[PDB]
Amino acid sequence: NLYFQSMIKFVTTEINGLTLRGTAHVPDGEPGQQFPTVLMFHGFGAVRDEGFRLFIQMSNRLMENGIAAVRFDFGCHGESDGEFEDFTFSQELNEGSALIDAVKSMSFVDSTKFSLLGESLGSVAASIVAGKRSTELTSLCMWSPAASFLDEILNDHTLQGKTVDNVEKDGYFDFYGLKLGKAFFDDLKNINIFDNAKKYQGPVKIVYGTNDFIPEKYSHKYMDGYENGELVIVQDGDHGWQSVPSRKRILDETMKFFRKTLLEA
Amino acid sequence: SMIKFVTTEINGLTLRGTAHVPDGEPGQQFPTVLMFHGFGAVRDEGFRLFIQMSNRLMENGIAAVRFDFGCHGESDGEFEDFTFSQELNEGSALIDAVKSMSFVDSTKFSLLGESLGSVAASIVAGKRSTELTSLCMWSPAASFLDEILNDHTLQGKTVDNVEKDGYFDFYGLKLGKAFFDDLKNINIFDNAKKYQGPVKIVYGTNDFIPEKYSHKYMDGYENGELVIVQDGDHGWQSVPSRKRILDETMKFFRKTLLEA
């Protein structure tokens, strides 16, 4: 009889002087109950909803099945503090690690049943944070990892197909009307995706859609380094799961994974 | 200043929003801009657009409030159940709900729209004209009835398979038959022309919406201003056009909410 209904509430935390703003979906439960929890990392220049309600749908699916879902705007993204011109991926990694501690400190979170979910660059961040905080995560799920982003910018000299070679001349990179700064580009040399990601030995699921513009080889590279990886290739899935059939599939595959790793273990 | 999260219930749906409240004395109220996002968008709008506008207003003493419409973003409701009529109902109800908020000066209250949100704002303003100090519309998607009903496309994709498939696929969201059946109920320009307050429309020359729709609005506004931004696009998705849209809009709301 002890019972409260599910709730969608807004949460904040402070990391390195920035207020990060987020949404928590807490399942139905009893007072004092703690829930297995999935912390979601959005992609580059994205927001915590992700594209076309993607993380919202995933959050509510988890909530309806007894798994709490938490998702923040990264620093310099969405409603969190920070100018895009100051964004660096190293800062995103620092924040992702700090968000594990912040979210585990929330009273409704079962710290022993805590996982990461990523989309696009958020999957890359999740893979690196998982390697550096390996004992903190029950499992790791990565959608459409944008693990080519260093190769693309540093070797192909483009960012989502647009040249990066005018940054010094113009003073910035124009990302859909946001000003991306020199600091982002100068920091890229510091990132090592796969050497760090392979340190995580827990259950990993990667979901890759055959229409993803990221080459499939990057998902296979992850798998080479994972002791307990599963790679699901979704026929006609795309990078953001932007068809009704592939959206249903990504929600199902992910709920299946977190049921197995968080609810049945 | 402070960024607060607000909710209101309309027709059984909880709408979820963000309020940017300026710094002030305890008990102070502020002129307020209520922002309407576009079709299948969220209350941030694309690439931080509404967030940037909200903080610009907040820093200048104007409170900014922006909700996810029903069936959008974090608000309740499935996209398959979305209709424009219920967006118009929610937009009207949001005027009353936001005016009832503690920090909102109900006498200095305006609407801002982007894309379909501008169309909704134009209709609600025409129908609730005494409630609004001013109206600003970015990139109004006022061709949307013509495109769907006459050209049988929705952002370039056919709508002629909806009956057979049971839905329209909008970037992985199921849009339902209810949306299309409801389009016959919608009148843009005869509603919009009723509003006599100051209106500003900002239109970018790279907008895929034909410029003629903004001129049609102007023909019906007694106090309209049309700004054409060279090389601006529908979502203000270049750094120069983003600076321009924020500046033009701050200027308009300074004039209409801070200096009137």
Author numbering:
A (entry chain A): -5 to 259
B (entry chain B): 0 to 259
Sentences from the paper on this structure:
Here, we report the crystal structure and biochemical characterization of a feruloyl esterase (LbFAE) from Lentilactobacillus buchneri, a LAB strain that has been used as a silage additive. The LbFAE monomer structure includes 260 amino acids that forms the canonical α/β-hydrolase superfamily fold with a conserved Ser-His-Asp catalytic triad. The protein forms a homodimer with two-fold symmetry where the active sites from the two monomers are oriented facing each other. The two subunits associate to restrict access to the active site such that only single FA chains attached to arabinoxylan can be accommodated, an arrangement that excludes access to FA cross-links between arabinoxylan chains.
The LbFAE structure was determined in the absence and presence of product (FA) and reveals a new type of homodimer association not previously observed for fungal or bacterial FAEs. Wild-type crystals grew as either triclinic (P1) or tetragonal (P43212) crystals under identical crystallization conditions, whereas crystals of the S114A variant were isomorphous with the P43212 crystal form despite being produced under different conditions. Several LbFAE crystals were screened, and one dataset of the wild type was used for initial phase determination. The unliganded wild-type and S114A structures do not reveal significant conformational changes compared with the FA-bound wild-type model, which suggests that binding of substrate, and release of product, may not require major structural rearrangements. In subunit A, two lid loops (residues 142–148 and 158–164) rearrange to flip FA toward the entrance of the active site. This type of flexibility is not observed in our structures of unbound and FA-bound LbFAE, and neither in the structures of LJ0536.
